Amino acid sequence: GSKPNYALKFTLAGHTKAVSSVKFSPNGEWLASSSADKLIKIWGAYDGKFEKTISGHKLGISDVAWSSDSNLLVSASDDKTLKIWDVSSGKCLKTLKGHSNYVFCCNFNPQSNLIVSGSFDESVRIWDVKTGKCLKTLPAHSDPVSAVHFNRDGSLIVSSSYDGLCRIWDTASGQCLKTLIDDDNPPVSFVKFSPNGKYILAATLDNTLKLWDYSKGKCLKTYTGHKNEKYCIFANFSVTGGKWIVSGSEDNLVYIWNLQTKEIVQKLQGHTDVVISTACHPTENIIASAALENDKTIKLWKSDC
């Protein structure tokens, strides 16, 4: 349990351009991947078995997210839309139109009655899942929005931007509750709530990750050693074994840190391009990593701790 020993189990091939994101289904069954090749692909979490392709976006996809019940996907595309997909039928249920530029990031709230989106048009939008109508448009940032995430009860949204700010929003009213990172720069490339909704993990494009106390609005911890000057790279709370922070890197490696000691406890070697996206399995010690154009594969890693 002390230090993880993640080892390569499967390499998943199929995507013909850069992979943009990977996410495990909450029920642990599936990995979903999105790509610059305009496709979503579904894989078996435990054996990497290719299950299907999902098609309909007219341009590249930047993000994909799962509903609580593992039955829906939402995707964010350069075609300026989001799409809600029934995963079982592979059919597009709704197209979410309203953004005036690339949609970069998306997530379901835990109720999975709302979707939150971030765009190059510098706004965050909230969508009704059943009707696909836009409920609210938040003038959230003054540069592209890099990440959006709901907290554990869906009462708050956290957003991040190249404008160098991290903000938190009241879901119901869409009013700003606070501006957490108010620095002019470095650009905030990623943010998400901790599983308890108490902290916020934030990446800045100066090779730095930080853990913030949302309530107190102050930085508890700092993680470094990786390379992150250009890309919006996902980061994760690993909580099934040892308590880790997980991130990709522009040196083609996956970085794992001890959350408390801030020490590098593993570096995963295999990718041949920037590791843009990592995801942690909800019940087993498994990591999915995915990489850009020169590589285009997804790797599944497994650990005893």
Ligand X SMILES: CO[C@@H](CCc1nc(CO)c[nH]1)c1ccccc1
Binding residues (CB under 6 A) for ligand X: these are 18, 20-21, 36, 60, 62-63, 104-105, 146-147, 190, 231-232, 234, 276
Tell me the closest approach of the beta carbon of residue 148 to ligand X, in angstroms.
Answer: 8
Taking the C-alpha atoms of residue 305 and residue 290, their distance in angstroms, rounded to an integer, is: 22
- Of 114 and 116, the one with the shorter C-beta distance to ligand X is 116
Which residue lies nearer to ligand X by CB, 162 or 190? 190
Characterize the bridge pairing of strands 103-108 and 91-96: unpaired
* Pair type for strands 244-247 and 82-86: unpaired
Tell me the closest approach of the beta carbon of residue 44 to ligand X, in angstroms. 23
Q: Report, in Å, the least distance between residue 39 CB and ligand X.
A: 11
**Residue 169 to residue 171: CA distance in whole angstroms:** 6
Given the complex with ligand X, which of 147 and 246 has the nearer CB atom?
A: 147
Q: How far is the CB of 295 from ligand X (least distance, A)?
A: 12
Q: Which helix (H) or strand (E) holds 95?
A: strand 91-96
Which residues are bridge partners to 219 per DSSP? Answer: 212
Measured distance CA(33)–CA(247) in Å, rounded:
17
Q: Of 60 and 154, which has the nearer Cβ to ligand X? A: 60
**Closer CB to ligand X, residue 36 or residue 129?**
36
Q: How far is the CB of 263 from ligand X (least distance, A)?
A: 25
- Report the nearest approach of ligand X to the CB of residue 261 (Å): 26
| Shortest distance, position 20 Cβ to ligand X, whole Å | 4
Distance of alpha carbon 191 from alpha carbon 162, whole angstroms: 12
CB 47 within 8 A of CB 10: yes
Which CB sits closer to ligand X, 85 or 104? 104
Question: Which one, 124 or 265, has the nearer CB to ligand X?
Answer: 124
Q: How far apart are CA 267 and CA 39, in angstroms?
A: 29
The answer to whether the beta carbons of residues 229 and 207 sit under 8 Å apart is: yes
Contacts for 133 with CB less than 8 Å, ≥ 6 apart: 127
The Cα–Cα gap between 30 and 48 comes to: 9
Q: Which residues in 106-128 are b (16+ Cβ under 10 Å) and which e?
A: bbbbbebebbbbbbbbbbbbbbe
